[PDB]
Amino acid sequence: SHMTFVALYDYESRTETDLSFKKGERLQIVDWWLARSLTTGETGYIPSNYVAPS
Ligand SMILES: COC[C@H]1O[C@@H]2O[C@H]3[C@H](O)[C@@H](OC)[C@@H](O[C@H]4[C@H](O)[C@@H](O)[C@@H](O[C@H]5[C@H](O)[C@@H](O)[C@@H](O[C@H]6[C@H](OC)[C@@H](O)[C@@H](O[C@H]7[C@H](OC)[C@@H](OC)[C@@H](O[C@H]8[C@H](O)[C@@H](OC)[C@@H](O[C@H]1[C@H](O)[C@H]2OC)O[C@@H]8CO)O[C@@H]7CO)O[C@@H]6CO)O[C@@H]5CO)O[C@@H]4CO)O[C@@H]3CO
Ligand SMILES: [Cu+2]
């Protein structure tokens, strides 16, 4: 119930395994967490310090 987060900052993917996201984008969590964007539906790793509980 606690696994929805929101991006605090924009992030641009660096690698083939991380996920880009925009500030305010919500992420469902499945230092680096596997997440699914609730905007794009894409799944990848995000830096956990860039998101906070939503
Ligand atoms: C037009 O479709 C009719 C569809 O309408 C209703 O769905 C709503 C949905 O309820 C609503 O959600 C609140 C919103 O959807 C948004 C998603 O919630 C959000 O996650 C995001 O979606 C992402 C996906 O997460 C990504 O996965 C990706 O999707 C693309 C697929 O990549 C996996 C790609 O393959 C392709 O999808 C095809 C699909 O193959 C997987 C194909 O299935 C045969 C076909 O889908 C049919 C579907 O079978 C059928 O189901 C009964 C029906 O679906 C309706 C929902 O039932 C209804 O629910 C209320 O029609 C579909 C279309 O014919 O076609 C798919 C499209 O080609 O393409 C995917 C799109 O890129 O990327 C998306 C977008 O980021 O964003 C969603 C909204 O943009 O809206 C939905 C309707 O648009
Ligand atoms: Cu929870």
Pocket of ligand 1 (CB under 6 A): 40-41
Minimum CA distance residue for ligand 1 atom 28:
41
Minimum CA distance residue for ligand 1 atom 27:
41
Give the number of domains in the chain: 1
38 Cα: distance to centroid of ligand 1 (angstroms)? 13
Instruction: Sort strands 51-53 and 26-29 into parallel, antiparallel or unpaired.
Output: unpaired
19's tokens: 């996920």
2 Cα: distance to centroid of ligand 2 (angstroms)? 3
Domain limits at 32? 1-54
Residue environment code for 18-40, b if the CB has 16+ CB neighbours within 10 A, otherwise e: bbbbeeebbbeeeeebebbbeee
Q: Quick one: how many helices (H) and strands (E) in the chain?
A: 0, 5
